[PDB]
Amino acid sequence: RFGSQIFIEHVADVDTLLECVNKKVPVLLSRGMARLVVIDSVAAPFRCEFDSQASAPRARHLQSLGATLRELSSAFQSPVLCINQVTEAMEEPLGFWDERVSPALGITWANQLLVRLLADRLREEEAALGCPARTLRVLSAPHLPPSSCSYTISAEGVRGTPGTQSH
Amino acid sequence: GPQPISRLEQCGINANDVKKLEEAGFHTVEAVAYAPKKELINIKGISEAKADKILAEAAKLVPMGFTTATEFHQRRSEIIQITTGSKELDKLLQGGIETGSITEMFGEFRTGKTQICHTLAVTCQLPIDRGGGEGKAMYIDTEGTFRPERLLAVAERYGLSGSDVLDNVAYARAFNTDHQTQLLYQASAMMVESRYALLIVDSATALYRTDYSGRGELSARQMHLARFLRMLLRLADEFGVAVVITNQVVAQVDGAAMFAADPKKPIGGNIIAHASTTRLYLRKGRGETRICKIYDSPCLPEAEAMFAINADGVGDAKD
Amino acid sequence: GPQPISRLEQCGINANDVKKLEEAGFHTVEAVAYAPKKELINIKGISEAKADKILAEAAKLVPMGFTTATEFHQRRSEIIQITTGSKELDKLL
DNA sequence: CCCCCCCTATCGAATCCGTCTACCCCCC
DNA sequence: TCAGTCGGACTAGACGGATTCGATACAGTTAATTC
DNA sequence: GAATTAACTGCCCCCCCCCCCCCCCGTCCGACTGA
Numbered sequence: 117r118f119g120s121q122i123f124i125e126h127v128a129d130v131d132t133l134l135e136c137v138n139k140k141v142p143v144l145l146s147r148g149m150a151r152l153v154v155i156d157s158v159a160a161p162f163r164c165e166f167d168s169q170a171s172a173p174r175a176r177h178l179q180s181l182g183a184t185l186r187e188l189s190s191a192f193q194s195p196v197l198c199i200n201q202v203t204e205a206m207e208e209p210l211g212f213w214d215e216r217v218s219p220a221l222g223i224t225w226a227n228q229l230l231v232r233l234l235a236d237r238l239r240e241e242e243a244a245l246g247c248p249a250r251t252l253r254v255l256s257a258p259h260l261p262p263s264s265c266s267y268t269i270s271a272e273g274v275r276g277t278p279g280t281q282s283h
Numbered sequence: 284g285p286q287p288i289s290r291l292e293q294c295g296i297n298a299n300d301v302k303k304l305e306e307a308g309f310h311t312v313e314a315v316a317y318a319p320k321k322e323l324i325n326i327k328g329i330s331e332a333k334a335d336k337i338l339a340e341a342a343k344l345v346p347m348g349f350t351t352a353t354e355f356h357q358r359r360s361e362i363i364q365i366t367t368g369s370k371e372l373d374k375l376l377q378g379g380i381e382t383g384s385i386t387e388m389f390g391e392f393r394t395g396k397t398q399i400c401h402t403l404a405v406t407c408q409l410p411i412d413r414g415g416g417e418g419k420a421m422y423i424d425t426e427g428t429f430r431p432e433r434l435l436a437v438a439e440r441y442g443l444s445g446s447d448v449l450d451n452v453a454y455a456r457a458f459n460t461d462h463q464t465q466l467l468y469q470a471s472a473m474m475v476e477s478r479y480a481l482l483i484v485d486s487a488t489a490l491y492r493t494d495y496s497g498r499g500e501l502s503a504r505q506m507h508l509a510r511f512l513r514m515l516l517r518l519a520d521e522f523g524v525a526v527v528i529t530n531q532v533v534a535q536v537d538g539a540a541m542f543a544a545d546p547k548k549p550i551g552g553n554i555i556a557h558a559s560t561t562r563l564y565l566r567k568g569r570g571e572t573r574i575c576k577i578y579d580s581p582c583l584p585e586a587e588a589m590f591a592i593n594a595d596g597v598g599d600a601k602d
Numbered sequence: 603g604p605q606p607i608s609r610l611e612q613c614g615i616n617a618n619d620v621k622k623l624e625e626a627g628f629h630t631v632e633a634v635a636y637a638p639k640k641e642l643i644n645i646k647g648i649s650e651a652k653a654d655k656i657l658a659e660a661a662k663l664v665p666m667g668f669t670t671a672t673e674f675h676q677r678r679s680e681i682i683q684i685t686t687g688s689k690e691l692d693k694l695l
Numbered sequence: 696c697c698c699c700c701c702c703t704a705t706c707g708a709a710t711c712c713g714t715c716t717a718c719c720c721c722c723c
Numbered sequence: 724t725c726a727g728t729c730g731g732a733c734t735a736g737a738c739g740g741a742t743t744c745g746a747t748a749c750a751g752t753t754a755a756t757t758c
Numbered sequence: 759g760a761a762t763t764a765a766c767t768g769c770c771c772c773c774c775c776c777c778c779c780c781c782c783c784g785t786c787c788g789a790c791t792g793a
């Protein structure tokens with residue numbers, strides 16, 4: 117029964133998200149309904165409240181959220197998947213030399229993670245062949261080399277292209 | 284029409300703040316009301332609280348709320364349209380040049396932009412029952428091609444006194460983009476002093492071709508042009524005059540092997556493309572006959588019309 | 603006709619500033635007045651405030667405002683036209 | 696009431712500019 | 724009769740590149756000032 | 759002539775590959791066409 121074993125929550129503020137992860141999530145994990153946590157956009161609440169001159173409160177909130185998420189994941193052995201947005205380089209470091217885009221939320225958020233992925237799509241300039249080009253890349257991991265592959269989106273779901281992994 | 288800025292001090296504003304706003308460029312209450320808070324902050328003698336009070340008073344004076352579409356439709360139906368001197372052009376434009384919006388004309392050389400500008404400069408002084416606007420005209424020249432002889436010829440065509448027509452036209456010459464932008468404040472002062480009904484800027488983008496040369500100066504040029512167009516739009520909204528500007532063309536070197544055999548597009552880019560409300564595309568026909576085409580409009584279908592340039596100015600194609 | 607650039611000395615401009623302007627290709631007050639600010643900034647040894655002051659002083663002596671069409675038509679009528687040596691071209695022009 | 700000791704990056708923008716001519720056929 | 728309009732041969736067709744913009748302190752070098 | 763202060767400039771190095779057309783300004787005539 118796929119439908120009845122998925123729970124959906126809505127938040128609007130950073131404080132609302134913090135309260136949700138502090139109160140509602142542990143109740144669901146402890147009783148055993150779910151063993152997977154997905155955040156649709158962690159960067160969305162933080163990009164609407166803090167400017168370039170308010171880095172310290174944002175860092176405090178990010179550290180608290182990361183600590184709470186890591187504690188819950190370690191306690192209940194449930195993977196945590198976070199979806200993030202990107203910002204351009206605006207060339208005038210962190211390992212991104214010739215990349216046009218980089219993950220958002222700075223380096224404080226990047227210190228809280230374990231495996232960092234990156235999904236990229238080449239626009240019509242490189243996608244003038246008829247179909248969009250999508251590549252899923254591994255940025256860093258304690259046990260995975262930097263690699264990449266290709267995938268397509270269809271009516272069935274996301275499927276990777278066989279014989280495409282780069283070494 | 285607009286309420287002079289000298290009515291703010293009756294609401295609790297000291298005279299020095301009003302004077303500072305006057306040097307800032309705001310001469311009416313409507314000009315202050317439309318301005319954002321950031322623009323008011325940049326004044327030396329105005330703080331955040333002073334700007335808040337001034338904005339509150341301006342919003343009290345000027346209505347800036349929601350309105351039913353019926354009221355807007357009724358109010359729009361009484362706007363004035365100025366005849367272009369040609370029956371075909373008037374039929375194509377469904378009345379003539381509208382007031383309160385920016386209209387732009389573009390084309391290659393000897394296509395008749397300056398002649399149309401002169402004809403509009405004369406015909407805007409006619410009585411409303413004859414297709415005029417009953418006002419004055421303002422001509423800003425950036426090339427040096429302003430000749431009052433054409434105005435005299437058009438006035439003689441329309442049976443007006445030549446001396447009076449020449450006395451109702453204001454002329455200024457722009458030598459650079461910075462000077463071109465600086466002329467839009469004295470224009471505001473003259474418009475609040477006396478009733479004007481037209482404003483010709485020819486050519487609007489002539490000096491930008493030379494003031495900014497390469498690709499390394501594209502961003503600054505586009506930002507300057509956008510600011511100039513915003514000033515034109517605020518003038519048009521505040522005083523309800525008709526704004527007519529002219530443009531130039533640039534070749535399409537890549538070509539792509541299209542049928543036109545000589546492709547060309549107007550200069551200015553997406554900024555002036557999205558800012559202009561109505562655009563007219565002029566091209567040469569045979570002899571003295573030219574062709575005008577609707578290039579962009581919110582309420583006019585794409586169609587073409589034929590006019591001609593005579594010794595009396597722009598007019599219908601003489602047989 | 604045009605006024606020499608040396609008249610900016612009496613308006614409160616350093617002699618070295620006028621020397622730089624004269625070495626940059628400007629030789630009259632009209633040439634300085636018509637020049638945009640960004641062109642004056644390009645000259646080495648001239649600041650933004652100095653350029654603004656120079657432009658203000660130059661504009662104080664050159665009329666760059668609004669005038670009626672009657673005055674322009676009056677001044678335009680005293681323009682000089684040079685004969686081309688042929689009656690036909692002179693009549694055509 | 697008095698003591699000794701510290702923090703952290705962000706956002707994308709904005710089009711221009713035309714060159715170059717070639718090549719003769721055929722009797723009542 | 725009669726002009727607008729669909730569709731199209733008309734002797735002949737190829738060509739390429741181009742750059743900038745931030746929000747900021749202190750020293751180096753040249754220019755103005757009063758003894 | 760000179761000690762002294764004041765004002766204008768400056769902080770820099772990576773892109774060498776090459777399918778790609780797109781919405782007409784053709785110039786105009788032959789014939790269709792319905793009225």
Ligand SMILES: Nc1ncnc2c1ncn2[C@@H]1O[C@H](COP(=O)(O)OP(=O)(O)OP(=O)(O)O)[C@@H](O)[C@H]1O
Nearest residue numbers: 391392393394395396397398399428571592593594
């Ligand atoms: N007195 C006149 N009688 C008839 N035609 C005239 C007369 N004066 C000018 N023209 C026509 O005006 C044409 C040029 O028009 P106009 O000056 O408006 O050009 P424009 O499009 O503004 O040009 P530019 O791009 O150079 O600014 C000439 O080709 C000429 O035939």
Ligand SMILES: [Ca+2]
Nearest residue numbers: 556557559560
């Ligand atoms: Ca538009």
Ligand SMILES: [Mg+2]
Nearest residue numbers: 396397426428
């Ligand atoms: Mg012209």
